[model samples]
Target: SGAIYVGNYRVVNRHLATHNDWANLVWEDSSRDLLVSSTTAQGCDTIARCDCQTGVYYCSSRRKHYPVSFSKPSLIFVEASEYYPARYQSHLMLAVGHSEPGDCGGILRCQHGVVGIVSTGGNGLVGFADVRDLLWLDE
Candidate 1:
């Protein structure tokens, strides 16, 4: 029978429980103020606006992480006419993204087949016309 020698050492346990949790945390932190303008811009009245002439729109919010809330998603659209604005109109696609560093988001399609890229961890909305317009009643 031979004698055995044992060594004393301390082990540290550092582990991430779930990938979803890490992703959720990253999303939550990265999404803050990603959709809104800064206070300085608001104070200077430099807030972005949609340019119908150029067919480009700017949407921003003051609150941080606001776009994440489903109720607070930004709205983008194209008016049919200045004279008969309410008569007919088309909504344009919107792209939302994160303000954080090194994050990639998703893309959202518009009512007219326009696609916008959304930032990582950010939230956005896509609107479409009535479904009845596409469906045939008699057919």
Candidate 2:
């Protein structure tokens, strides 16, 4: 599986490997809760002015294979790598780190709103892809 779009929000690809854990699968039932709870669930396109405590969630394990295995972890803004590997040239990415691992594509939310999707993390840091972009005229 590759990228997924939720309305205008984009979720990066997720892998089982901890390093490349950005985007992960969330059961439909769980998504319903997030949608109802958040009016602006999408992340921000820029990381500037977003150096605050951001919230993140991941599917550590499912209970009885149910979609209720949502877990939140404490995340803070850190220095984004100047040499982040971006899949697209137009893609603007950010780097975030913590003591724990947030699977790739994990949406990072701050005071400004949705910031970016978790991409890859190494050397005690995680990378995020800015998912917020200008709407396509055709759409």
Candidate 3:
């Protein structure tokens, strides 16, 4: 048998993330204020699976409000959006494209219906994203 390497070198032989170990989905859209400025509404960080287990991209996001409302007493989107609430992660293996580094982070050059991935590792972002896609208003 080859040298058996079992378990991650951290956290009690942990291999898979628990139900609570995912990054929150952050809209991070600067235009959000303009989008919901009318009703004082705001978006929330959407916790998503950033783990790159090959090309098995899994993700799903729900709104911060049930019946998805625009108005409530004094509630904010971030608070209600706190819990990821656990759901079946959808797999949409979007492909990555050519990327080159610059002063800022590299630009993810995904084209032809492809997708990109950015690994937030110890060093930093491992990939790139298209500014249009990353900052677009909507689909």
Q: Which candidate tops TM-score? A: 2
Alpha-carbon lDDT, every model: 0.22, 0.35, 0.19
Candidate 2 positional error at 98, Å:
3.3
| Pick by TM-score: 1 or 3, better one | 3
Worst lDDT run of 10 residues, candidate 1, spans 1-10
State the lDDT of candidate 3 residue by residue for 1-139, as single tens digits.
0010112111110112232222321222221210111112233222122332232221112111111101111211211212233222121122332211211111112222212322111132122121223223221
| lDDT by residue for model 2 (16-50), tens | 22222223322212111111111134533433234
Error of 2 at 45 (Å): 14
Clashing pairs in 3: 24-46, 24-47, 25-45, 25-46, 25-47, 95-115, 108-129
User: Which is superior by TM-score, 2 or 3?
Assistant: 2
User: What digit string (tens of lDDT, one per residue) describes model 1 on residues 47-126?
Assistant: 11222111121122322222221112333333332222322222222333333212222222223321222222234442
TM-score of every candidate:
0.16, 0.36, 0.17
